DNA sequence: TGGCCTGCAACGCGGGCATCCCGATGCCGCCGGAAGCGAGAAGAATCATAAGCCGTAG
């Protein structure tokens, strides 16, 4: 939802993660930042999906 | 297509009968072995008590 929010589409440049764990502690999930990077890395990984 | 069962006819040998000789055997007395499973001991299958990682949380 996060993600949907602030306009990161598939068709558009890069950005940085740091942005996005900081905004999701900020608003929506603030429970730490060590579980939301490493589920952002368990979603990035393609051999775990 | 080749071989087998059976009817007809001819031949032979043994079933039955008795008994004399015979071989097992039931019984009696004396001696042997194995069973008797109960128990002691060993081996093995199973049960009971720690960790390692699977991923977010502190």
Sequence with gaps: ???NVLGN???KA???SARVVGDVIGKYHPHG???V???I????????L
């Design 33 to 35: 930042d060590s579980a």
């Design 1 to 3: 939802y996060a993600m």
């Design 37 to 39: 990077y490493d589920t």
């Design 9 to 11: 589409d598939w068709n």
């Design 41 to 48: 890395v368990r979603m990035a990984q393609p051999f775990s």
């Design 14 to 16: 890069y950005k940085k």
